[PDB]
Design a protein around this nucleic acid. Structure first.
Ligand SMILES: [Mg+2]
Ligand SMILES: [Mg+2]
Ligand SMILES: [Mg+2]
Ligand SMILES: [Mg+2]
Lengths: 159, 159
DNA sequence: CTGACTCTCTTAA
DNA sequence: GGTAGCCAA
DNA sequence: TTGGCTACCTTAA
DNA sequence: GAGAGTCAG
C-alpha cells in the first residue's frame, strides 16, 4: 500500500522537514519588503530526498552550503508550493509535531499566492504571521525585530 | 488508514530514529564485556513520542539528560526489542536511510536473544558487528578500539 | 515582482 | 543520534 | 546475566 | 532546521 508510502513522507517531514518564510529587504519591491517561502528537508542520504522528490513530482535537490556531502530537498516556487500544500492538507489533521507551522506557513504562502502582500495592510499582516511562525520553531531567528521591518514598510509607503 | 500511520512511524524512524549497541565493561559478565542494544527517538514534542509508544504498545518515555524539556522514546528490553524488530521486518524492505543499521542492529539483538554471546567466539562476533554498526553511523563513537575490547575478552577467557 | 543559487545562523537530534 | 557507568533485580 | 536510570559525546539537521 | 543577499528573469 502506497498510503503507507505517503505516511512515510509525512512522518519524515514531521521529523526533519522545514517550513520557513524569510524576509528580504529589496528596494524595488512593493513595501520595500519581500517574504520568501521555502519548504525543505536536509539529509546526508541523498537517496531518500530522491524518492520524495519523485513521489511528489516537485522540488529540486542540491548540496547544502557549508556542509559538503549533505543535501537539501527544496520546493519554493509558487506553483510547486501549492502542490506541496495540496498534498499536506490531506493529512494535516494527523500532523502532530509541525501542524501549526504548516498552517501558518500555508496561510502565508496562499496569502502571497493571492497577492495579499500587494497592499500595505496585507503585507504587514503576512510579515506579522512570519514572525509568529518563527516563534513556533526552535532553530529559527530574525535579523531585525518586527517593528523595524514594519517601519520600513511605512517608510516606503510615504513614497 | 492504520497502514498510513505505520508509514508515518517508519518515516519518522528513518529521520530521527536511533539504533545503538553499547559496549559496557562489566567484570562479572561472561567475557568481561556486555553489549547493550538500545533503540530510541529523541524529540522536543513529547506528544509524537506518546503516540508511537501507544501504537507500538512498547517502550517508555523520559526526559533527556542534559537537555531539559526534551524527550526520548526508548525501547531496550529484550522482550520489547523483539516486538520492535517484528514490526520493522515488515517494512524493512522499503527502509532507505537506516536499512543497514537496522539489519545490523537486528543481527546483534537477535544474537543476544539466542544467547550467542554466551560463548567466546560468539561474543567476539557480536562485538565486531557492533563496531561495523558504528561505522554505519555519523554520530556514533567508541571509547576503546575494537582490538582493545577483544583483548579484554581474551584476558577473561584465561581466567 | 518572483526564481533560484549562494551564504549564514541555530539546536534538536 | 549514539555510548557507557552503575547498581539493583 | 539483564533492567533501566544516570551521565556523556557527536553532528545532521 | 531556518533565515537573508543578490541578481537574473
Ligand atoms: Mg523565493
Ligand atoms: Mg535523520
Ligand atoms: Mg539494556
Ligand atoms: Mg534530526
Amino acid at each position: 500500500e502506497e498510503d503507507f508510502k505517503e505516511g512515510y513522507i509525512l512522518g519524515f517531514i514531521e521529523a526533519e522537514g522545514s517550513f520557513s518564510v524569510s524576509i528580504k529587504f529589496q528596494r524595488d519591491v512593493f513595501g520595500g519588503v519581500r517574504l520568501d517561502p521555502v519548504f525543505s528537508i536536509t539529509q546526508k542520504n541523498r537517496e531518500v530526498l530522491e524518492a520524495i522528490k519523485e513521489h511528489l513530482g516537485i522540488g529540486r535537490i542540491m548540496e547544502k552550503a557549508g556542509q559538503p556531502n549533505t543535501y537539501v530537498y527544496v520546493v519554493d516556487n509558487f506553483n510547486e508550493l501549492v502542490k506541496l500544500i495540496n498534498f499536506l492538507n490531506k493529512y494535516a489533521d494527523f500532523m502532530i509535531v509541525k501542524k501549526r507551522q504548516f498552517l501558518m506557513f500555508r496561510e502565508i504562502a496562499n496569502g502571497l499566492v493571492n497577492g495579499e502582500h500587494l497592499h500595505i495592510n496585507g503585507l504587514k499582516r503576512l510579515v506579522k504571521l512570519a514572525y509568529e511562525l518563527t516563534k513556533e520553531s526552535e532553530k529559527g531567528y530574525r535579523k531585525y525585530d518586527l517593528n523595524h521591518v514594519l517601519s520600513i514598510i511605512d517608510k516606503w509607503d510615504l513614497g
